[PDB]
Design a binder for these strands. Structure first.
Lengths: 252, 252
DNA sequence: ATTAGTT
DNA sequence: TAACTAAT
DNA sequence: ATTAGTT
DNA sequence: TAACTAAT
């Protein structure tokens, strides 16, 4: 299937992602900004156990690393009864320099969809932000304290990739992905590609230009280091669900 | 003094007032209006005793009279620990046809005060509304229930003069007083007269044109049936207190 | 005694 | 979304 | 655990 | 002038 011909393009078969052509991002602070260090809130054993596995996997993939930073924000337990780690980065958001909100809202994104393109492929990239590297100078910004009493493990960890919870993560990825798919857009003039952060839509007039496009797009995302979710892929269809909207023939 | 030469013009010496040249007023209702009859609220003996004297005086002067009406509004006790009668006429106000608010606000009234008139006389009429008669067809509107258990006196009373609490009483009096002092305004072109309901101000350039005006005005108010309060009169002065404002030379 | 109107 | 101030 | 924001 | 809902 589509899964056999493109092993590299799917998170199921391709491994962890990594945008190899994108330089590590530098995060500029405001002109008056100084490091803020919030002490970790005491966490229950239940949450600490629920979260510990996610931390260890991240350390193993190298997405998380030991560090020592004058910045520190609190880790939160958030529950379905599974505990995800959720860094509260608002005090870091407050101190980072604003960037233009270049990402269009869904509505406007769809307006630029001609009606002659009724064959749809919808992909969503898996763990998009973690594919973008973080420059070592900007990594200390996102440090949190990891403290596993029942193991003697206390110390700070921070991120090597674009983190969850950072106000600029969605815009910076959308821009990064636009850079990487600019050449694809030029090699396929008759195709339409909509990008909403980690949510893509390819549109053609024939189910064949679509097949030939989805192949090309999957080929390209895999070679650039991105991974689509095959579980949610909607390939060469006449109606698809994109950004809440259901697109059938042209309606909506 | 001014009190000896004008006995008729002062409430102190002139008796109860009565605008003899003004026909009894008819009060038109709205087009959809029907009589409303609110039952008297049970009143304590303390209030009933505090209010009883005021009622009896009013019956004696003929300002209050027995009647039988499909209209009825509640009497209230209001306290200084003296109990005044206060008819709640809002449900009657709601059903009476609106009239233009021709009375100007103090501020605008004063704007038309030239600076060459720095000699002031300020009068305020006593019980102004009660000087205006009420047409017998409009009297039932303002009926209240008077019930003195410890005397066997129960039954309805209503007003023969413009009542307190009626939304149109101030405008209708101001208009009535303007009609009555129109000729005075013509016989004294060099005088300035401001009227705010029951609050008058005469203004001249000399303390003599003022004396000769105050005499003429007192003469006129007395013959028309109005009564000024001598206790509060401010006669031929260079500074006076009118409608909150203090008028001295021309300032304010 | 009711009620229009207000952070 | 909690009670007053004034008004008649 | 905090907090921005809401009749 | 009384507590929430979601957000990180």
């Amino acid at each position: 299937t589509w899964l056999s011909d493109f092993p590299q393009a799917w998170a199921e078969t391709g491994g962890m992602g990594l945008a190899v052509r994108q330089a590590p991002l530098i995060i500029p602070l405001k002109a008056t900004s100084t490091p803020v260090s919030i002490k970790q809130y005491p966490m229950s054993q239940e949450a600490r156990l629920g979260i510990k596995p996610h931390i260890q996997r991240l350390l193993d993939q190298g997405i998380l690393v030991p560090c020592q930073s004058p910045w520190n924000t609190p880790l939160l337990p958030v529950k379905t009864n599974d505990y995800r780690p959720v860094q509260d980065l608002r005090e870091v958001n407050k101190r980072v320099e604003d960037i233009h909100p270049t990402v269009p809202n869904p509505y406007n994104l769809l307006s630029g969809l001609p009606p002659s393109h009724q064959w749809y492929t919808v992909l969503d990239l898996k763990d998009a932000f973690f594919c973008l590297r973080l420059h070592p100078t900007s990594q200390p910004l996102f440090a949190f304290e990891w403290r596993d009493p029942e193991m003697g493990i206390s110390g700070q960890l921070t991120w090597t990739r674009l983190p969850q919870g950072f106000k600029n993560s969605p815009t910076l990825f959308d821009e990064a992905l636009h850079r990487d798919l600019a050449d694809f857009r030029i090699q396929h003039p008759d195709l339409i590609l909509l990008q909403y952060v980690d949510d893509l839509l390819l549109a053609a007039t024939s189910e064949l230009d679509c097949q030939q496009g989805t192949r090309a797009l999957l080929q390209t995302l895999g070679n650039l280091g991105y991974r689509a979710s095959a579980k949610k892929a909607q390939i060469c269809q006449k109606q698809v669900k994109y950004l809440g909207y259901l697109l059938k023939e042209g309606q909506r």
